[PDB]
Amino acid sequence: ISSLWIAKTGLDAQQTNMDVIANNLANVSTNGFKRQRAVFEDLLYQTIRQPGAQSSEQTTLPSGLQIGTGVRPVATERLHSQGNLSQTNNSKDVAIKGQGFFQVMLPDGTSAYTRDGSFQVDQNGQLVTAGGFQVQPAITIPANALSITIGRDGVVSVTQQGQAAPVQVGQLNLTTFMNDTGLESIGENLYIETQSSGAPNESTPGLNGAGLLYQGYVETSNVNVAEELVNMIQVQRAYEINSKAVSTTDQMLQKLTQL
Amino acid sequence: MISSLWIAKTGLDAQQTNMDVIANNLANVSTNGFKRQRAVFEDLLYQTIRQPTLPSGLQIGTGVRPVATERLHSQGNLSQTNNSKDVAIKGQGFFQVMLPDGTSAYTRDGSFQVDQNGQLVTAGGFQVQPAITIPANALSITIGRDGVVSVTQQGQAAPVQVGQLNLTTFMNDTGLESIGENLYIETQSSGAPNESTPGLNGAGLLYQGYVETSNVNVAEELVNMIQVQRAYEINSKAVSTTDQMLQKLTQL
Amino acid sequence: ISSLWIAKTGLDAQQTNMDVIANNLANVSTNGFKRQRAVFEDLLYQTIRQPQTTLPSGLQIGTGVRPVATERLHSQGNLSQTNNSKDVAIKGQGFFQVMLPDGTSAYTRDGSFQVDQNGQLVTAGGFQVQPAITIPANALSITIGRDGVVSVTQQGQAAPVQVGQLNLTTFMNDTGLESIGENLYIETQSSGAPNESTPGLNGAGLLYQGYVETSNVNVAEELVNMIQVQRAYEINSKAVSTTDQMLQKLTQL
Amino acid sequence: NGNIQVGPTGQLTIQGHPVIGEGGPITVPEGSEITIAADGTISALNPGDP
């Protein structure tokens, strides 16, 4: 019977909604995390019979039978807003203002883009992210480095022992996209390009719509728990209602088969 | 679907934004040249239920929504820093600085320094647009009511004037877009800036060795925190009783 | 099956009551807001049978309840100081008039005004105040007295120059105003045609500068009403449950 | 049901039904602050009037 299938689709949609809510709540402490939201869409409708003639000296209701089918999850979009900044006092942590993504090099050979600014230094001096993925512009900080300073622009400098003037060692240019929502997300806070998102364009910070770099700060996740709790309540109640519908359909079918 | 949950959600969001702006105001109370913010709320669209010269109609609300946030561009107090290169504006106006990219920004926090090349810059590296240049071997720097900045040198009686600090004014101060480091940029809401010498065309005067403080009233902020906490709790109770009612309904 | 429909009407009435309660609670910190209360009434009564000292022996079945109207208490809220120079609060009756983009006019109660780039005084949202008060540049200060007169001083002027007046409108029946969103009302047939006047005359209010009118929402009343709504909803669900039991027993036998 | 309402022209209407008192059903001024006494007398005060 079609009613069971419709209710099954509704229950699956509610389960997926609860899944994305739980995913948002779980990594509320993840740095540079953009919260998600699931949008659904109804399926097709079967027209058993078309409406007839009406509005002829009468006010009869239109006699048209058009049965629904259910609902499917059509998309899950993330909100690329701006999160708050938390101080860490670590000179190798960069927070990003505006739009942009640091470009890292995946081990297989391709490249990914990320927002999580918390970097470390390997044994060879190269600047990598937490996980070992080398930053594609390949900033190398020499040894005996007294302190590393990264300005509001992408330039990174390090003061030596005797020399008064800091020596420039690299530029942290960053990429921008035409549609940031279309990036395909994988683990480790990484995004890879798709056809939905335009070809990335690299630029220096502060120009061509790029953001700015703050040293010693980390961008926090833009998750709002007040939304999550009410969404949880709503999905739980909808799940209960659909279960009640399933129970009623089962009872009426069982009454029928007792004939 | 439940009608009353999505109203209490909007109420909670409004109270959260109110607490957010209150916390932002309280945090930077010791910064110089800061203007407090107030958020203004408004309700959403109303749905009218149609009935078959009625004294009143049946209408149902939907919630509340924060529409805008304004800044009180009043005059803060002054604190004497004993420095010789700190300027406080008495009245209304904005110093013009140049961002590294090339555009122009406008600020009010006056605490300036001298870069290695001798020019006058703000704390952060940005230089003042009229480009005041103070040569080395400077005995003292004096900035009067007008924009004239003079420097005294050894062995000379007449001080040599090096520049003038023209300040810009706007038709609508509140329309300025705010970015970090106490910097404002013009928009369409704020008219095109117009330059003026201090004390003329409504522009303010300058005091040397003083810094303007923030116009934040902590006593109001504490009571506002109490109010927003109570409102948030009441909306939470509304959510809870809606949940209880719906749970009672669905177990039928 | 009649009992099911009656209980459905009761549940819907309680739901709308909870809806208006939640709406009142949500915007408790909205300037110039007025609380609403819903009023219900009975439906048609079916007279099944016409009527020493015994009972009249007459039958008359009810039908249910529907929501009739939602009245707004146009009372006077408390005044809170914002210290701004362009915030006004109404003492008494009256509404400010604003011009909608489409061409018609709307009326509001809260006072929180800014200045557009051309100089005219608008509300928070861009809508222009109808009498078209223009504030020129280089304005040292702005004064809005208890009357409608608004004045601005300038550099080296012994006396200020008047730059307009904030006249405000009144209605015969302010309860009948249809409240569209965004803190606005529109004239409808239920309310009379607006009549404008200077503040302080012809029954209008007075203007206080630097203060705003807070909402007049009584939280304790809302909480008690909410408790009653929940309990009534739970009671009404029992009617549906018992009728379901009766129908199930009837179908079984 | 003592929930009285006032129309645009000043009629005390309860659910669209004008209230009836002695000597004509009812009629009030345009915008008076209506005050109802303990016995039934309806005091009216023109707004703005002393």
Swiss-Prot record, chain B:
Protein name (database record): Flagellar basal-body rod protein FlgG
Family statement: Belongs to the flagella basal body rod proteins family.
Cellular component, GO, one term: bacterial-type flagellum
This protein's encoding gene: flgG
Annotated transmembrane regions: none
Keyword list, A-Z: Bacterial flagellum
Localization per Swiss-Prot or TrEMBL: Bacterial flagellum basal body
BP GO terms, sorted: bacterial-type flagellum-dependent swarming motility
InterPro entries attached to this UniProt entry: Flag_bb_rod_N, Flagellar_basal_body_rod_CS, Flagellar_FlgE/F/G, Flg_bb/hook_C_dom, FlgE/F/G-like, FlgG_G_neg, LlgE_F_G-like_D1
UniProtKB/Swiss-Prot annotation, chain D:
Compartment(s) of residence: Bacterial flagellum basal body
Superkingdom of this protein's organism: Bacteria
UniProt record similarity statement: Belongs to the flagella basal body rod proteins family.
Subunit record text: The basal body constitutes a major portion of the flagellar organelle and consists of five rings (E,L,P,S, and M) mounted on a central rod. The rod consists of about 26 subunits of FlgG in the distal portion, and FlgB, FlgC and FlgF are thought to build up the proximal portion of the rod with about 6 subunits each.
Protein name: Flagellar basal-body rod protein FlgF
Section of the entire sequence shown: 102 to 151 of 251
